[PDB]
Design a protein around this ligand. Structure first.
Ligand code: CLA
Ligand code: CLA
Ligand code: CLA
Ligand code: CLA
Ligand code: CLA
Ligand code: CLA
Ligand code: CLA
Ligand code: CLA
Ligand SMILES: CCCCCCCCCCCCCCCC(=O)OC[C@H](COP(=O)(O)OC[C@@H](O)CO)OC(=O)CCCCCCCCCCCCCCC
Ligand SMILES: CC1=C(C/C=C(\C)CCC[C@H](C)CCC[C@H](C)CCCC(C)C)C(=O)c2ccccc2C1=O
Ligand code: SF4
Ligand code: SF4
Lengths: 73, 34, 151, 60, 73, 80, 139, 30, 742
């Protein structure tokens, strides 16, 4: 939702990092993306694809995740 | 993050308990004869 | 005078009787050690080996661990030793399940019941030895340091 | 065929299949492969001669 | 060869310096110094004795790939 | 075990049996070739799969043919 | 015929290349031979031993180990008197080599050909033909 | 933003998918 | 007089007939080729003399004459180095200004633009900069003229002609009998006393009468053409006594045993000459005189023709204890009837000596102005490390050839060989364990440091700023060697080397030598060295001990030293020969020596080499980055390979562009090797079948049937290209880096 507001400036987040081997410099170094936790920045382009096909909010990305869990079942 | 507790709860379980348990069971299954 | 001879007076066996392998000192030490001690129950064999191993596991985790510089270094080291004990006791359990067919006799480690008794003793001994190391290091300041308390 | 003639091999798994060798001898007994053909080229095994049947050998 | 070509041609265009590819791609030392050696520097400085940044993970993966590759030998 | 086959192109040269390090092959009477003998494999359980018999075969395509199959302690060459 | 367990063994100072726990729990191989001399040979498992004049007995972990010594004893010392046995942990002694008293390289009556295929190797069936059927590829 | 309840619904549906995955794997294994 | 000269006269006729029949030397190859494998089999077995002939006499004769041919090639090579120094060099310009002029003895022709390689090396000269250290040798010899370099080139040419004549003469006219070659006592007496002892004595005499006066005049500041010619020191004993006043008394102090008179020119100074940064040549003269006395004395140990002396058979057969059976009995018989056993020992020793040479020559620079010529120091260290490693693996190669071929169990019952083969599982299992332990505890420390540094945990690393793995024993030995002058070597004035501690020796504002401090990074890279040496020993030893038989292949000696496999059975016996352990251990030798030369190059640039600023500050070449960056693999990648490969990559259009070309060419050759290493012969033979079809279609099939290379040859070609590619990559990288920055 932060990225869709400003897609050329915000760096897309793939998922967060919870790694008990990290030092505090590592935790600070990965805390980009405008959030308060370490993150991987997505290189998959899924933000640009989901933006282009209609998805606007987290609720509809989540609704898509739920629908795919149903389809997987 | 919402449900921020879940990464602390699951990542050690999925990353240590899951392999340990499935390796232990896989070891038992590959070694067993009947 | 020859100090190396064929093993067990059998030349074609794949071993050589040597001073390191077959001295009276080596034979005495192996027999004295709990794993090969005669007259020792498999559970008791496991308790003695476990007490030894759990006792010395705490120290490397405590002194060289991630939380070594913290005041919770001993608790982290004990927990890390305990976690390693639980992983190893799982290894002992799974080895026992696959290796040994179930037999009534339990008087030997190389039996399903005997290895289960050994694993039981090793867990009790290892947790107790790790605990004993924790109690001793906590009480004694010199053990908390690396021997530099005198300095 | 006859001894000394030049022959073309028709055994598909031969090294010298569709190559020319020359017949050394032909047995007269109940032998399964009587035509002994020698070849200028050597096989991968280094052998330069092999026994063949009549229906695997044509005069050239 | 395909992804080295694509990536070098694109990073030179994305700088505004497409002529650097135009002059250096015609010999192999241009590919070695101007693509592999020149662009290695943000990657291999992802950690150093002066700190680390969020490219440290790729800095560790790059060495990890060199190890696996050599272990294959 | 491995499967070892002898084809009727065998000239009875006895070389594959001599090559055999594991006494897998032996000679039996056969009227097909001039030598009066053909190789046989009544002991393919001892066959390690070395394929020394194939190397010794002077036929254009080896009459003796080892086909590596199920592995055992014997066919793996395990002294343990 | 049966292995005389009391046959004396060659003088070997021992080695680490000998047999392991699988010999006493799966199978062991023995080779016996008669030597005219007190002579040094090379063990398949290591260094050098001395075969005694008269009858010798060996314990090896492999049949190839036994047949390697058999070739060394036949090519260097000309012993043709070697018998190779497979001894089970049960105590059963299985005679192996030469299996019917005559070497495999010599023809013998009463030998039945095993593994013999009536056609040449290029007449083997293609794998597609033998697919999803139990029929064998050798015709 | 996603609620903890929404994450729990996703975890319920993934558990149902895990059970169906176990059932397919056992059926394929026979 | 049982040691006698015995020769067969006119054994072999000098005819060109066998030249015209390639393959004449073996029964297999003499019937001519039928496949292209014959062509390769010709070169592969040519020098394998004991594969052609049964008799040890003809083998020994072929070896003796081939050694004269090798000596002829070495003398021709030396004569060429002297001629290129005389004719195509700036040696005379370098003599006047050794610290500014760069040595160059190779000039290229202008053909295809390649004349850019004639760079401006200095002294009004253009040529390829040379790094073999010949200029420093010639200045140490006292040559001081290109005319004398022409006379040395002619002396090398005359020696090359005499050695090629002697090889012809001793194979074709007067070839010694086997009983001549089997005189190990006589040969050792002569090679200790005569070769090494009179070699040192004559060289010490040359140093005292030529090198010492000329180099005193050179370091006083006298120009090379103002220096008296070297025979004027021999005659004018008054002029020689000006420089060294002990010459006023002559040889009376030597014979009367008043040797402390000769302390002017036979010193024990130690350390380096401050003017040149090299060893004091008075120390080198005393060194060679002392070695000459012991080498001559040593060459009187063995019994030849008069009852005095040792029988080496008696020495060996008496050394037996309770652990080792019959002991060294039978080893004399081995070493006087097997050439491969002798070559195994002598190659391991020559390689060890070459490795010792590289360490000692960098630490104690022996030539004037060689220490501050950093391209030469890096080149001769790297060269003698590679010659050492190759020769050590050939020692194991010919130990394997001895074991497969010349070993007889009947003559080796219960001796040291029998006992080693009879506990080879214990040897190889303990070596295997130590290599696993030492790969975990040396390289895993690097992986720990990579991980912790990547994780932001700089306090959790093995480093000088974190957990300190200090090399306390190496630091302590350095302490002892710094305290040794005046204490445990009381008559020494300076330390044996400034690497141990002490002063910084600077020549032309560049560091000649300075203390090499050892820290956590040095502990880690030395245990990397111990690990890579251990694993190379494991592969080579496992090949020697299991060359004749295994539990896998019980009759491996019947297959030979060099066989590819014994089939896909027993699970697969690919690379089961002793040859294939030499093949696998030459890679691990490559790995070992590559890390040694990388450790040397980075440590000397980071902590030793550089410029001495005012106040004695030393600005090093890479600015002391070894300590905090050689503890991680990323540091070796970044701060050593990436940082220092700048010169090879950016060498185009300069005189070092040849190094950029060889850098790329050797990357190519290295990669090209992996085609031979990762592939197998059967693919290439079926591909050749399709190509043979295309030739048959055009009626252009060759009569020598093309074959894919043998399995062993595919391995040998892959290894040869891999070594050439890797070493050539390092050669180009090292040389462009240190010519640019040092
Ligand atoms: C042994 C070490 C050695 C080495 C590596 C070199 C290397 C070199 N020398 Mg030096 N040189 C040496 C010894 C050496 N030389 C000696 C001992 C002398 C004194 C006689 C000289 C005198 C000398 C002079 C005077 C010059 C060189 C030059 C050169 C360069 C080019 C030579 C060339 O292109 O020839 C190519 C010449 C050919 C005829 C082509 C060779 C093609 C044939 C086919 C060779 C094949 C050999 C044959 C097949 C072997 C089998 C014999 C047969 C019976 C089968 C090159 C850097 C030149 C240089 O530096 O210029 C700046 C130069 O002018 N050299
Ligand atoms: C004191 C006498 C003496 C000397 C100097 C040598 C020297 C040598 N021998 Mg030995 N040898 C000797 C006695 C001697 N031998 C005896 C008695 C025997 C019989 C048991 C042998 C049997 C023998 C064998 C079987 C072999 C050698 C080999 C060698 C060469 C080793 C390679 C090397 O480093 O050469 C480089 C060093 C040099 C100094 C080259 C110089 C060459 C000449 C010959 C040295 C002597 C010149 C002369 C005496 C000096 C006069 C000084 C004058 C200017 C005042 C070397 C030339 C090996 C070899 O390479 O064969 C050729 C070899 O295979 N020798
Ligand atoms: C298959 C795709 C996939 C992948 C690769 C990951 C990857 C990850 N997830 Mg999971 N996740 C997924 C789908 C996936 N997720 C789905 C669909 C959901 C909704 C239920 C979640 C819900 C979820 C939670 C709630 C959490 C993670 C977390 C994590 C991270 C740590 C691992 C862990 O604790 O797992 C735990 C994951 C689960 C218990 C859910 C099961 C995941 C999928 C459905 C399993 C599918 C397996 C795959 C298809 C095939 C399996 C066989 C394979 C081995 C060959 C890791 C980045 C943790 C995290 O974010 O830490 C940073 C965490 O706390 N995940
Ligand atoms: C992928 C998931 C994963 C996770 C979540 C962890 C988690 C952790 N690792 Mg890591 N580790 C992993 C994979 C993982 N590991 C792998 C793959 C390797 C090999 C490369 C390592 C190698 C490694 C090393 C070398 C070290 C760690 C350490 C640690 C601890 C962090 C430091 C700390 O706060 O100390 C506090 C830690 C404790 C107080 C220990 C708690 C012990 C647990 C809670 C007991 C668990 C019982 C056990 C799992 C029973 C399982 C039985 C089996 C059937 C599953 C933490 C427990 C450090 C460590 O051990 O800490 C001491 C450490 O030194 N790890
Ligand atoms: C492929 C073989 C090869 C090649 C091309 C070179 C090339 C070179 N060497 Mg090296 N070397 C090698 C093998 C090789 N080396 C081996 C195997 C050894 C160990 C013995 C050495 C030991 C060595 C030393 C000790 C020195 C060189 C030097 C040199 C350079 C000048 C060449 C010269 O005139 O030497 C001339 C050699 C000298 C002037 C000094 C010789 C001193 C040694 C101790 C003489 C010993 C001779 C004796 C016969 C050895 C017998 C072996 C012993 C174990 C019994 C040149 C870079 C010199 C150098 O780097 O200067 C910059 C130098 O000082 N070499
Ligand atoms: C093989 C090496 C070698 C050779 C060929 C020579 C040869 C010679 N030396 Mg030298 N010398 C050598 C090694 C050698 N020496 C060594 C190793 C040392 C150190 C102990 C010396 C120390 C030395 C001194 C100190 C002197 C010579 C002198 C001489 C000359 C003898 C003249 C004489 O008897 O006056 C001797 C004078 C007397 C009063 C008696 C002669 C040219 C003499 C000479 O003419 O110097 C140029 C001389 O004074 N030598
Ligand atoms: C004093 C040293 C010495 C001596 C006398 C020998 C002598 C011998 N060796 Mg030993 N060997 C040595 C050193 C030595 N080697 C070293 C240092 C190694 C380690 C690399 C080996 C490794 C070795 C093995 C593994 C084998 C031998 C074999 C042999 C025998 C025959 C070799 C032959 O015909 O090749 C003829 C020569 C060649 C084919 C030359 C090709 C070699 C390379 C590819 C050429 C190098 C080119 C150049 C340096 C770089 C390329 C430059 C490019 C840009 C143009 C012979 C007994 C073989 C044998 O038959 O055993 C009995 C064998 O199997 N040796
Ligand atoms: C970079 C690549 C690489 C690596 C890592 C190895 C690793 C090894 N080689 Mg190999 N080798 C290689 C390339 C490599 N080789 C190549 C290119 C060749 C070409 C010829 C060979 C040829 C070769 C031979 C011929 C021999 C070896 C041997 C060895 C072993 C040395 C003993 C040792 O250090 O154990 C320590 C293990 C390592 C250093 C591996 C790295 C592990 C690091 C420290 C971290 C461990 C990670 C940890 C397990 C994570 C666990 C969690 C995870 C599982 C989830 C080891 C298994 C020798 C051997 O096996 O006998 C001892 C031997 O004789 N190698
Ligand atoms: C090395 C330690 C050592 O001092 O060995 C010395 C010891 C000496 O044995 P001996 O006294 O029998 O040696 C007598 C002769 O062989 C020596 O010339 O050798 C062994 O016992 C074998 C050791 C193998 C290596 C074991 C590790
Ligand atoms: C390419 C390749 C071949 C084919 C290579 C062949 C047939 C070599 C032929 C190359 C030409 C015919 C000659 C080579 C000449 C070179 C230009 C320089 C050679 C220098 C020396 C030979 C003198 C194999 O036979 C092989 C076998 C086993 C493992 C790997 C491989 C493998 O990789
Ligand atoms: S080798 Fe080939 S041909 Fe000779 S016998 Fe054995 S099978 Fe028949
Ligand atoms: S493969 Fe080796 S063992 Fe099996 S038959 Fe052919 S030769 Fe005898």
């Amino acid at each position: 939702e932060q990225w869709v507001l400003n897609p050329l400036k915000v760096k897309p987040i793939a998922h967060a990092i919870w790694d008990p081997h990290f030092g505090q410099p590592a935790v600070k170094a990965f805390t980009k993306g405008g959030v308060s936790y370490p993150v991987n920045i997505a290189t998959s382009g899924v933000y640009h694809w989901w933006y282009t096909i209609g998805m606007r909010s987290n609720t509809d990305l989540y609704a898509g995740s739920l629908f795919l869990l149903f389809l997987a079942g | 993050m919402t449900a921020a507790y879940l990464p602390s709860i699951l990542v050690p379980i999925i990353g240590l308990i899951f392999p340990g348990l499935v390796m232990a069971f896989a070891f038992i299954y590959i070694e067993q004869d009947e | 005078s020859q100090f190396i001879k064929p093993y067990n007076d059998d030349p074609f066996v794949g071993n050589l009787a040597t001073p390191v392998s077959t001295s009276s000192f080596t034979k005495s030490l192996l027999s004295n050690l709990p794993a090969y001690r005669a007259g020792l129950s498999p559970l008791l064999r496991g308790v003695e080996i476990g007490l030894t191993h759990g006792y010395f596991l705490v120290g490397p985790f405590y002194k060289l661990g991630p939380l070594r510089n913290s005041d919770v270094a001993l608790l982290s080291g004990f927990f890390s030793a305990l976690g390693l004990i639980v992983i190893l006791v799982a290894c002992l359990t799974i080895y026992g399940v696959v290796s040994f067919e179930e037999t009534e006799a339990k008087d030997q480690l190389q039996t399903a019941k005997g290895w289960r008794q050994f694993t039981s003793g090793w867990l009790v001994g290892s947790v107790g030895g790790a605990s004993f190391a924790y109690i001793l290091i906590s009480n004694i300041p010199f053990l908390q340091t690396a021997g530099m308390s005198m300095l | 065929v006859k001894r000394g003639s030049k022959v073309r091999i028709l055994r598909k798994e031969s090294y010298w299949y569709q190559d020319i060798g020359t017949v050394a001898t032909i047995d007269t007994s109940g032998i399964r492969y009587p035509v002994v053909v020698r070849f200028e080229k050597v096989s991968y095994s280094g052998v330069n001669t092999n026994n063949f049947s009549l229906d695997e050998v044509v005069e050239v | 060869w395909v992804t080295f070509y694509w990536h070098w041609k694109h990073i030179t265009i994305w700088q505004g310096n497409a002529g650097q590819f135009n002059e250096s791609s015609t010999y192999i030392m241009g590919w070695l110094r101007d693509y592999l050696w020149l662009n290695s520097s943000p990657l291999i400085n992802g950690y150093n004795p002066f700190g680390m940044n969020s490219l440290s993970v790729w800095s560790w993966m790059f060495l990890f790939g060199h190890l696996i590759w050599a272990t294959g030998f | 075990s491995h499967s070892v086959k002898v084809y009727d192109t065998c000239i009875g040269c006895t070389q594959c049996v001599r090559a055999c390090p594991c006494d897998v092959l032996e000679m039996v009477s056969w009227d097909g070739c001039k030598a009066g003998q053909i190789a046989s494999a009544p002991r393919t359980e001892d066959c390690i799969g070395c394929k020394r018999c194939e190397t010794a075969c002077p036929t254009d395509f080896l009459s003796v043919r080892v086909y590596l199959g199920g592995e055992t302690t014997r066919s793996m060459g395990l002294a343990y | 015929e049966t292995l005389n367990l009391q046959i004396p063994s060659p003088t070997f100072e021992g080695s680490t290349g000998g047999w392991l726990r699988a010999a006493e729990v799966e199978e062991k191989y023995a080779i016996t031979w008669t030597s005219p001399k007190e002579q040094v040979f090379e063990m398949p498992t290591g260094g050098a031993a001395i075969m005694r004049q008269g009858e010798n007995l060996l314990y090896l972990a492999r049949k190839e180990q036994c047949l390697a010594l058999a070739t060394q004893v036949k090519n260097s010392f000309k012993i043709t008197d070697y018998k190779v046995y497979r001894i089970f942990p049960s105590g059963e002694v299985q005679y192996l080599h030469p299996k019917d008293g005559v070497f495999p390289e010599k023809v013998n009556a009463g030998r039945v050909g095993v593994g013999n295929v009536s056609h040449s190797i290029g007449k083997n069936l293609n794998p597609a033909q033998i697919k999803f059927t139990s029929k064998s590829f050798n015709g | 933003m996603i609620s903890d309840t929404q994450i729990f619904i996703a975890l319920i549906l993934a558990l149902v998918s895990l059970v169906l995955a176990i059932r397919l794997g056992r059926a394929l294994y026979q | 007089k049982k040691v006698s000269i015995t020769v067969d006269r006119d054994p072999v006729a000098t005819s060109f007939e066998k030249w015209a029949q390639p393959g004449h030397f073996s029964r297999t190859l003499a019937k001519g080729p039928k496949t292209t494998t014959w062509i390769w089999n010709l070169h592969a077995d040519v020098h394998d003399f004991d594969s052609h002939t049964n008799s040890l006499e003809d083998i020994s004769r072929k070896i003796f004459s081939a050694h004269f041919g090798q000596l002829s090639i070495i003398f021709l090579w030396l004569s060429g180095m002297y001629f290129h120094g005389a004719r195509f060099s700036n040696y005379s310009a370098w003599l006047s200004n050794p610290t500014a002029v760069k040595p160059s003895a190779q000039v290229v022709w202008p053909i295809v633009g390649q004349e850019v390689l004639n760079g401006d090396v200095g002294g009004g000269f253009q040529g390829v900069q040379v790094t073999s250290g010949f200029f420093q040798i010639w200045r140490s010899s006292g040559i001081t003229s290109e005319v004398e370099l022409y006379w040395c080139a002619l002396a090398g040419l005359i020696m090359s002609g005499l050695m090629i004549f002697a090889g012809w003469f001793h194979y074709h006219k007067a070839a010694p009998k086997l009983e001549w070659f089997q005189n190990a006592e006589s040969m050792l007496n002569h090679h200790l006393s005569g070769l090494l002892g009179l070699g040192c004595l004559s060289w010490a005499g040359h140093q005292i009468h030529v090198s010492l006066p000329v180099n005193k005049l050179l370091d006083a500041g006298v120009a090379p053409q103002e220096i008296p010619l070297p025979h004027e020191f021999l005659v004018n004993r008054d002029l020689m006594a000006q420089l060294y006043p002990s010459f006023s008394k002559g040889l009376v102090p030597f014979f009367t045993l008043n040797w402390s008179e000769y302390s002017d020119f036979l010193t024990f100074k130690g350390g380096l000459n401050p003017v040149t940064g090299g060893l004091w040549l008075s120390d080198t003269a005393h060194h060679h005189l002392a070695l000459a006395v012991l080498f001559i004395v040593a060459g009187h140990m063995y019994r030849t023709n008069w009852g005095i002396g040792h029988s080496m058979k008696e020495i060996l057969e008496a050394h037996k204890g309770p652990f080792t059976g019959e002991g060294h009995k039978g080893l004399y018989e081995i070493l006087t009837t097997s050439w491969h056993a002798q070559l195994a020992i002598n190659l391991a020793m020559l390689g060890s000596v070459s490795i010792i040479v590289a360490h000692h020559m960098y630490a104690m620079p022996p030539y004037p102005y060689i220490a501050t010529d950093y391209p030469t120091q890096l080149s001769i260290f790297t060269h003698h490390m590679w010659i050492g490693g190759f020769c050590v693996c050939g020692g194991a190669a010919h130990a394997g050839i001895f074991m497969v071929r010349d070993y007889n169990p009947a003559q080796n019952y219960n001796n040291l060989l029998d006992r080693v083969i009879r506990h080879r599982d214990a040897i190889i299992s303990h070596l295997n364990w130590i290599c696993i332990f030492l790969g975990f505890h040396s390289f895993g420390l690097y992986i720990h440091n990579d991980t912790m540094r990547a994780l932001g945990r700089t306090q959790d690393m093995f480093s000088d700023t974190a957990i300190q793995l200090k090399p306390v024993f190496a630091q302590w030995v350095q302490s002892i060697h710094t305290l040794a002058p005046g204490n445990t070597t009381p008559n020494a004035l300076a330390t044996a080397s400034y690497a141990f501690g002490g002063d910084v020796v600077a020549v032309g504002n560049k560091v000649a030598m300075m203390p090499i401090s050892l820290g956590t990074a040095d502990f880690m890279v030395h245990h990397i060295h111990a690990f890579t040496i251990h694993v190379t020993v494991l592969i080579l030893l496992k090949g020697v001990l299991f060359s004749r038989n295994s539990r896998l292949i019980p009759d491996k000696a019947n297959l030979g030293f060099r066989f590819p496999c014994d089939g896909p059975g027993r699970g697969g016996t690919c690379q089961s020969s002793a040859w294939d352990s030499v093949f696998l251990g030459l890679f691990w030798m490559y790995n070992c020596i590559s890390v040694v030369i990388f450790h040397f190059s980075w440590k000397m640039q980071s902590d030793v080499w550089g410029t001495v600023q005012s106040d004695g500050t030393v600005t090093h070449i890479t600015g002391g980055n070894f300590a905090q960056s050689a503890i991680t693999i990323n540091g070796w990648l970044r701060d050593f390979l990436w940082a220092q490969a700048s010169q090879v990559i950016q060498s185009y259009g300069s005189a070092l562009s040849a190094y950029g070309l060889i850098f790329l060419g050797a990357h190519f050759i290295w990669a090209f090797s992996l085609m031979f290493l990762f592939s197998g012969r059967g693919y290439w033979q079926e591909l050749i079948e399709s190509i043979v079809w295309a030739h048959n279609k055009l009626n252009v099939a060759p009569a020598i049937q093309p074959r894919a290379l043998s399995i062993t040859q595919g391995r040998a070609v892959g290894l040869a290209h891999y070594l050439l590619g890797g070493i050539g990559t390092t050669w180009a990288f090292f040389l462009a880096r240190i010519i640019s920055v040092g």
